[PDB]
Amino acid sequence: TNLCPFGEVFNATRFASVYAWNRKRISNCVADYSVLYNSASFSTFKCYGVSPTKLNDLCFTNVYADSFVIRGDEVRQIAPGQTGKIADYNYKLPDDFTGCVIAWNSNNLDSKVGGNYNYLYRLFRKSNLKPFERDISTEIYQAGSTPCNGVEGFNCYFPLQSYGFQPTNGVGYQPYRVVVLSFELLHAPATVCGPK
Amino acid sequence: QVQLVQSGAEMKNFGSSVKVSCKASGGTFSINWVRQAPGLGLEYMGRIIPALDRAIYTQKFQGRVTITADKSTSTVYMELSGLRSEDTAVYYCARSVVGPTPNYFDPWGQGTLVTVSS
Amino acid sequence: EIVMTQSPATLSVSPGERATLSCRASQSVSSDLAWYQQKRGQAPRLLIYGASTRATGIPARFSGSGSGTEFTLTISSLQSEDFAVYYCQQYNNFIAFGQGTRLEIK
Ligand SMILES: *[C@@H]1O[C@H](CO)[C@@H](O)[C@H](O)[C@H]1NC(C)=O
């Protein structure tokens, strides 16, 4: 039927940081994944639970497009079962995951000369983040016996740490925006289907 | 190069509150509060992230210091309700990369001298 | 409760090729030091945002060094202007300012 809003997700000039990932509900769209699959801009297109070529002709119950930014090294933290600081704390894709994670180098897009620190991750947390959830809580973390009393002190830390993104650095430090196309809820009539 | 410009009241009487704010350049860089007693070691009061508007204080300065953020001009204010005779200390506005600890103060602010008249 | 004790607080050197400054910690520091140049009647400026990686400005001839408990700073070109109070700073655990090391022309 109507045209898909898929362009807005990929072409959005701004992606929120990984700790608070923007989740875009998708409805009334035409599943035109042919352009995406034929695109040579996407460095990583590793789909889990579905084949990349089958995306063009398939009916999707509901699509959630969660987008964020990750450092150049360890872009594959998003892959289910992969444990790391950003994976365990900021965004944890559930081990049983049904969707395609697509990520590409955004150094020319999301990196500024001298550093762009707008994207930041929660380095410290009391417990590992529950799967597919967001915790924007920014209280002072307590790493000591003394109660921090909501106050930053010795053995007390802020949870969020900013990324180091420099255009000069190569594959080590480059903004690699990730768009996790989690879909196929299988809970309602499908509003997304392949073109006919 | 150019320090973050800050404005603050000077020579307030006892019991008054000084409101000092600095203009952030722009971004998610945290703004941290550094108190320097005259001819003594520097001290750290707290911080507030401008983007997230999160309040951070120190056990030494809990309650006495209050920090507010004005998003329109991207300025973060500092109100100090209780003033003491020894509290006549310059309060520095420092921009640092937001981290679990206040990172390197790159760069510092102008620096506002405050004196107390008993 | 980490205090950045500085042993040569009154360190003083006449202009020369070599200058030595020191900084110590009560507990282990994972090379998260910083040096701030606080000139007389001036706002401080960052010098070594890393443990030894000098700043993006013009800290030419200024070189951090050391890791762990012991830290040191050396400068090849001791000009008159750069003479100031250098405040060792540690943020491995919490923001902890050293008492400060004045530098004099003695
Ligand atoms: C918008 O997205 C399409 C793919 O959906 C892409 O071909 C095009 O280059 C994008 N334009 C911009 C300005 O990002």
Residue numbers in the entry:
A (entry chain A): 333 to 528
B (entry chain H): 1 to 32, 36 to 52, 52A, 53 to 82, 82A, 82B, 82C, 83 to 100, ...
C (entry chain L): 1 to 94, 96 to 107
Paper's wording?
The Spike (S) glycoprotein locates on the viral surface and interacts with hACE2 for viral entry. The RBD of SARS-CoV-2 S adopts two distinct conformations, termed “up” and “down”,4 and the “up” position is believed to be required for hACE2 binding. Here, we develop six human monoclonal antibodies (mAbs) from two elite convalescents in Wuhan and show that these mAbs recognize diverse epitopes on the receptor binding domain (RBD) and can inhibit the infection of SARS-CoV-2 original strain and variants of concern (VOCs) to varying degrees, including Omicron strains XBB and XBB.1.5. Cryo-EM analysis of the spike trimer complexed with 14B1 or 7B3 reveals that these two mAbs bind partially overlapped epitopes onto the RBD of the spike, and sterically disrupt the binding of human angiotensin-converting enzyme 2 (hACE2) to RBD.
We also determined the structures of 7B3 Fab in complex with the SARS-CoV-2 WT-Spike-6P and Omicron BA.1-Spike-6P (Omicron-Spike-6P) at an overall resolution of 3.5 Å and 3.4 Å, respectively, and found that 7B3 showed identical binding mode to both WT-Spike-6P and Omicron-Spike-6P. Due to the lack of details for the locally refined 7B3-Omicron-Spike-6P complex map, we then use a relatively higher resolution complex structure of 7B3-WT-spike-6P for further analysis. Unlike 14B1, 7B3 Fab can bind RBD with both “up” and “down” conformations on the Spike, although the epitope of 7B3 on Spike is partially overlapped with 14B1 binding sites. Local refinement was performed and improved the local resolution of the 7B3-RBD interface to 3.9 Å. 7B3 bind at the straddle (β5–β6) and is closely associated with the RBM loop. The total buried surface area is 1023 Å2 from the RBD, and the paratope constituted all six CDRs, with the heavy chain and light chain contributing 73 and 27% of the binding surface area, respectively. The medium-resolution complex structure revealed that residues 483–490 (VEGFNCYF) located at the RBM loop predominantly contribute to the 7B3-RBD interaction by forming extensive hydrogen bonds made by residues Glu484, Asn487, Tyr489, Phe490 with Tyr47, Tyr59 in or adjacent to CDRH2, Asn92, Asn93 in CDRL3 and Pro99 in CDRH3 of 7B3, respectively. The interaction of 7B3 to RBD is mediated by eight hydrogen bonds and one salt bridge formed between Glu484 in RBD and Arg50 in CDRH2 of the heavy chain, in addition to van der Waals contacts. By superposing the RBD region of antibodies-RBD models, 7B3 would clash with 14B1, suggesting that the two mAbs bind competitively, which is consistent with the competition BLI results. 7B3 predominantly interacts with SARS-CoV-2 WT-spike at regions 450–457,470–472, and 483–494 using both heavy and light chains, and the contacts made by 7B3 on WT exhibited 100 and 94% amino acid sequence identity with Alpha (B.1.1.7) and Delta (B.1.617.2), respectively, which correspond to its neutralization breadth.
